[PDB]
Amino acid sequence: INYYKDAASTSSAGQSLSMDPSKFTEPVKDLMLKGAPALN
Amino acid sequence: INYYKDAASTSSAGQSLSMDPSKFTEPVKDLMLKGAPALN
Amino acid sequence: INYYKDAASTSSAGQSLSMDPSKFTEPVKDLMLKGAPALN
Amino acid sequence: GYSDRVQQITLGNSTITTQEAANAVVCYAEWPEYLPDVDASDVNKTSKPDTSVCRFYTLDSKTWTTGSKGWCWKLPDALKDMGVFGQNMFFHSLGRSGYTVHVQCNATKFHSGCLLVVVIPEHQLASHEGGNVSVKYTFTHPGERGIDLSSANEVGGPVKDVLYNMNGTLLGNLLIFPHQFINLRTNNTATIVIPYINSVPIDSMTRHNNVSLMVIPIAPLTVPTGATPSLPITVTIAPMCTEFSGIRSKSIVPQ
Amino acid sequence: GLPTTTLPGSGQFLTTDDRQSPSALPNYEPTPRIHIPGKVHNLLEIIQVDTLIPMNNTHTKDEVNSYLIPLNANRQNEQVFGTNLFIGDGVFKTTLLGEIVQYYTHWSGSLRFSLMYTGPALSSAKLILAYTPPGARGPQDRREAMLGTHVVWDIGLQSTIVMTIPWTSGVQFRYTDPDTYTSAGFLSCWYQTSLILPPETTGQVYLLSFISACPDFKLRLMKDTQTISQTVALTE
Amino acid sequence: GLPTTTLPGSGQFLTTDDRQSPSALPNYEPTPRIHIPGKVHNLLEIIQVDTLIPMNNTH
Amino acid sequence: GLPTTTLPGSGQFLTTDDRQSPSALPNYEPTPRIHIPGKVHNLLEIIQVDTLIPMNNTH
Amino acid sequence: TVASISSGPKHTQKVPILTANETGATMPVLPSDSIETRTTYMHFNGSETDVECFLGRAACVHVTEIQNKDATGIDNHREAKLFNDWKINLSSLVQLRKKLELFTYVRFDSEYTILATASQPDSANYSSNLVVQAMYVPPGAPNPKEWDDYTWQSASNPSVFFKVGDTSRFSVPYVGLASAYNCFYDGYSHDDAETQYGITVLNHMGGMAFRIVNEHDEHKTLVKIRVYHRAKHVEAWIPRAPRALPYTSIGRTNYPKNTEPVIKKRKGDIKSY
Amino acid sequence: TVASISSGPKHTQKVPILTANETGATMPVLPSDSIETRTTYMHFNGSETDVECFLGRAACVHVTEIQNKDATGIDNHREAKLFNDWKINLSSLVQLRKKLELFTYVRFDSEYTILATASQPDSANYSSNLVVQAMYVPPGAPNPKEWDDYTWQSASNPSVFFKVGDTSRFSVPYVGLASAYNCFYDGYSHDDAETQYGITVLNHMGGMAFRIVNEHDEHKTLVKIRVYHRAKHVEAWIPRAPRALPYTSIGRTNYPKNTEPVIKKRKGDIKSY
Amino acid sequence: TVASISSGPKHTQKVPILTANETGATMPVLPSDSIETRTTYMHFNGSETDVECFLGR
C-alpha cells in the first residue's frame, strides 16, 4: 500500500533479476564459441 | 480514505489539468488565424 | 499480515505438532513388539 | 576460409585491411546509431554529413621503445582538426558521434611485447599536485598529439603515472573497460567500435570529451638481437553516425 | 480513534530498513531517461569480467612489473610462481574480484584463473598449473603438485589457458577475510618441459595472469571494505 | 489494541507534506461560489502572455 | 493521517511476546539445509527415552 | 485423545512388562499394562514444550557498558569505554546456554532487543539525552578505532541509532556458514599441533560495536547496554545429556577443578524415604 | 538451477580451455570443462548483490554543527555557527563515495534521515529542548544571512522542523538536470582557459541550511547534525575500476603525492605461498 | 505529446511570424514557424505549476 502520492516516496525497488554479463564479458563483434578455436 | 467528516479537512486537491491560456493570450473579439494577415 | 519483506522478520513459527519419539526410544534394527519376548 | 584474423572495414572513401586481427570489440555490445526522436530534446533538425565526416583519419605515429610508458588520446579532441569533421565540430553548438578505432603495430615472430588498447568512458584525469588543483583545459585537449605518459609533469597538467590510470585506480583493472590486447606473437591490430555514451542526448564537442583511448605497453617490447630497439604504433580513427546541431558562428577555444 | 500499542524498537533508525517517506518536492517531474549503453544490474555481472593479478608482488613500490610473471629459457622441473587462495587478501586483493569480494562477508563458487603467454611466436613451452585443495601444504615440487587439480598447458597459437579452481569444500561458504577453517588451498605453476627461445632471441619472457569468477559464484552478507578510509571530511 | 512501531520522522513537520486534519469549524457552510471571469489554473497559462522587456536598461 | 490512541503497555518489552521486526540484513540468502538424522520437535519426545537414576545416593 | 483406556484383569502368556534394556530401546509401557485402568482423556497437546516455544523467548545474552565523556587527551578510546565491541555469542551468560546445549546442531533466525539505561554516579545538573549507535560489524570490516572514526559512517554495514532509556529491535536471518550452528564441535580449524580445540567459526554470528553519538556535556554519563536474544524459526537436531557441572569458558566444555558433588547425598540409607 | 552438471572423462579435438585473451572477451569456462564433476544445485539467487541493494542502505554523508546562543552582538551568524548550510554531495565522506564510483552514471531517488543530538560542554542547569529547522535551498533562492532572516519563512522552499534527539526523514525525487548524475565528467563548463575541470552541475543535488528555532537560554547548547542518505530506485551504467588511492577533494579524481604502494609486497618470493 | 513537430523549408505567402501586437493578443508562434525542426516529445505535464501546488505548501 503506498500512503503517499509521489513515486519517489515508495520503498526500495525489488530485484532486477535481470543479469546479463555478456555486454561486459563478451563484447566481441564476431561470436566466439567455447571449444572452437579462438583464432581461425 | 477520509478520516474526517468535513471537506476542509481533506488533503490538497489534485491537478487541474485544465490549462487554457486563450482567455489571457487571445481575448480578441474577431478570431485571428496564425499565418493570415493580422490586419486586413 | 507480514509487514516486512524478508522471512527472518516474521514472528515465531507455530507448533511442529510433529512428535515421533521412536527415533530416540526404539532405534532397534529388528522391530520389537510389546508383549512378545524381548530376546527369542 | 574466413578467419577472425583477416578483416576489411570500409567507411566512406577509406578502407583498412588487417591480415592479423583478434576479432573486434563493440563497446557494451552496442553499435553506433543516430539519435532517436524519443530521446531528443533540442528542437533543431541535425546535420549528417555522412561520408565526408565518417571516414578514417590516421593520427601521427608514436614510437614504442623499451622505455615507453603509454599514450592517451581524448575523443572528439584527437580529431578536432581532421578535414570536415573538425570544421563541423567548431561550427555547431552541439554534435554527437560513435567511432571505429583501429590501433596498428606489426613486428616479426622474434619480437615480444604486448600493448593494452582500452576505451574509458568519461576519463576525468587527476592533477599531480593533489588536493583540489584542477587540470587546465589545454592539458586535457592535446589534439592529435595525445598525452605521453612518459613526458614530465607540467603545471596545470594531469598526473602521468601509469599504475594509476591517471585517476587513482589500478592499471590491472582497466580490463573492466572495452579493450583488446596487441600481443606481437598473436595480433598486429586492435579494433574497437564505440557507440555514443553520455547522460545527455547530444552535448558540446569542445567542452567535454567523452572517451579517452589509451594504448599502454604492459609486457615490454623485446626485439631480436641487434634489431633496432623500437616499433612505431599508428592510431587510425573514424567518426561514425556523426550528427551536428545548432549551427552558428564558430567556437573560439583556449590556446 | 483506533486503539494501538507501540512495540520495542519504536523510534529507532536502522540504516537497512526500507519504508515509505513523504516527498519533499511534491509533484516534481524528473528528467526523462534516455538510453545509455552499459547498464549494470548485479555485482555478479561484473565479477565475471577478468582483470590482471599483480602476481609478481615482490617489488617495493607499485609498478607495471608486478603484473609480469617472468619465465626463464631452458630451466627444467622448476617452479614458476605460487600463491595461496585468500581471494580477499594478498595478490587478489586489488583485482576487481578481490575488490568486490571485500564488500561481502562470505563467498562460495568456482574461480577462473587464466595465463596469457607473451613470448616470441617462434618459442615454445609446456607449463603445468596445479590447484591444491585445502588440507595439504603448498606443493614443494611438481611431483607433489601434479597429484591435485592441474592442467598441462601447451603454448601455441592459442595464447591463453583458462584454469578453473573448482569449488572444493566441506562447508558451503568461506569467509572473504582470510580464515583458517575456511581456507581454500594453493595455486602453483611449474615447467612441464621448459621454455625454449628461437635463435637471435634472448632473455626473459612474461606471462600475464587474470582472475574472474565462474557463473557458480555466490557472495553474501554485505559489509564495509577495509580498502578505503579517511581522517577528515573532504571539501571542494 | 493493535501493535504498532513508529519510524524515523515521526513528529516532524515538513512544510510540503499533504495530509488530513480535523476541521476547527465542524459543520460550517462556506459561501456559494458565483462565476468570476479569469480563472487561472497553471502558472504555465500566464507565462504565455507577452509583456514588455526594459531592454534599454542604460538609465 | 488516521487518528489513534495508545494503550497502557505501549513501549514495554515483554521477553515472551512474538512480533515482526525489520531484518538488519535485507536480502541475504541463508545456507541451504541438508538432511541431519535426529531432529527433535518436542521436549515430550525426549523425556520418553529412559536414563539411569543414581538411586544409591549414599556416597 | 485418550490418556488411558479402560483395561481389566489379565492372566496371559503375553507379558508386556518384561523386557531386555540391553537392546537400547525404551519399550512403550503404559499404566494399563500392569494395573486395571478406566478411560480418561488427555485434554492437552504439548504445545509449550515445542522447541520453537522452548527457545523462543528473549534471554539476556550480554551486558556491556560505554561512557560519554570528554575524549580530549584519551589515547585509547576503546580502553576508556568511549565505545565498545562484542563478538556475538550465546554461551557467555549460562541460562540460555544450558537450554541450547540440550541439542548438538541448532538453526534459527535471531531477534535482538537492546535496552540501554543511563547512570550518573557523580554529581550532574541533569540527565542528558544520548543516542546510542549499534553497528553490526561482520568479520573483515574495518573495526572502529576511535569513537568517531570513518568506520561509524557504516555505509555498507547495518547500524541502528536509538535513545538511551529506549530499546532497539531488529532481527537477523540465520547467518551460519553451514546448514546449522554447531553447539559442539570435536575438531580443529586445521591439523595444527597447537591450534585451539572446540571453538569454531561454525558458531560465529557476527559482532557488534556500540558508542554514544553525543559529544560530551560537563558531567560524565555511564550507559550500560543489555542485549537480549530470541530464537525464531527454530530447528534442533540430536539431543544430548544436560549440563551438570558449572561452565568456565565460552566455547569449551571444560568444568572447574575440585567442583562439588552434583548428585545430592541421601540423609539416610538407600532404604530411606 | 544447476551449479555444476555431471561430466566425465574427455579426449577431444574440442578444447574449451584454450582461448585468446587478446580479443577482449572472458570466455565462460566452468569446472566441468576441465575436471570430472557431479551435479550440484545453486540454492542461491544473487539477491543481495543487486545494485538496488548495494546502494540502498543509509550511509552517513555529512556531519555539521550549529549552536544556540545569544546572538546579541554577533556580526556574522554564519560564522558563529548560529546557523549553517551544506551543498549536498555524496563524495565528502569516502565510504559511500567509493561504492558509487564503481559506476559512471547513476540515477536514483534519495531518502534523507537527519539525526540531531545536543551537547552541553560547559555547566548548564539543564538540557533545553530545541527544535531544528532544515531548509532545502535550491540554487537561486535567497540564502539565509542571519539565523532569523525572512529567508526562514520558506514560503516556497521545502523545510522540515524536528526536535534535537529525534530524527527527520523525507525523500527527494531524482533532481538531476540530465538523465543520470555523472559520477565522473571529463569536461569543463565552457571552453575557458582557466575554468575548473571535473566538478560539474551535472551532479548537483541542491543544498540545505540548518538552524535552531529556539531563542537562547542562559547556557550554550551545541547541536551536531548528521545527514544519512539512502538511494532508492537505483539505475547504474558503465562499471569502472574501483578506487585504489585515497581521495583528496570533493569532485576531483586527484590522489595525494608520495602516497604508499597500494599492492602488498610479498614476504618472500614470487614462489612463496 | 509532441513538443516540436518536424518541419522543413518554407517559401510561402502565409507568414505566421508577422503580427500586430496592438490587438492585445499573444499569437501562438512556435520554433517550427521560423526554423526547420525535428520531432521531440514533451515528457512533462506541468504538474508543479498548478496553482494548488504553488499555494499549497
Structure, described:
The structure is cut from a larger assembly and holds 3 copies of chain A (40 residues), 1 copy of chain D (255 residues), 3 copies of chain E and 3 copies of chain H. By secondary structure, chain A is largely without helices or strands. Chain A has one helix at 22-25. The relative contact order of chain A is 0.10. Chain E has a single domain (1-236), classed as Sandwich (Jelly Rolls). Helix content of chain E is 6%, strand content 31%. Chain E is built from 3 helices and 15 strands. With 273 residues, chain H is mostly beta strands. Chain H has helices at 51-55, 94-100; strands spanning 2-4, 40-41, 59-68, 83-87, 103-119, 131-136, 159-163, 167-172, 181-182, 207-212, 221-239. The longest helix of chain H has 7 residues, at 94-100. Chains A, B, C: Interacts with capsid protein VP1 and capsid protein VP3.
CATH topology of chain E: Jelly Rolls
The total count of strands of chain A amounts to: 0
**What are the secondary-structure elements of chain E, in order, as H or E?**
EEEHEEEHEEEHEEEEEE
CATH topology of chain A: Rhinovirus 14, subunit 4
Shape assignment of chain A: rod-shaped
Indicate the CATH architecture of chain A.
Irregular
Largest sheet of chain A: none
CATH-derived architecture of chain E: Sandwich
Structural class of chain A: little secondary structure
What is the number of independent domains of chain E?
A: 1
Q: What Rg of chain E do the Cα atoms give? A: 24 Å
Measured by DSSP, the beta-strand proportion of chain E falls in 25-35%
Between the first and last Cα atoms of chain E, what is the distance in angstroms? Answer: 52 Å
Name the biggest interface.
E-I, 97 and 96 residues
Report the helical percentage of chain E.
under 10%
Shape of chain E: elongated
The SSE order of chain A reads H
Amount of helix of chain A: 10-25%
What's the multimeric state? part of a larger assembly
PDB class: virus
Keywords: rhinovirus coat protein, Icosahedral virus, Virus
Entry title: rhinovirus 14 mutant with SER 1 223 replaced by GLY (S1223G)
Chains A, B, C: rhinovirus 14
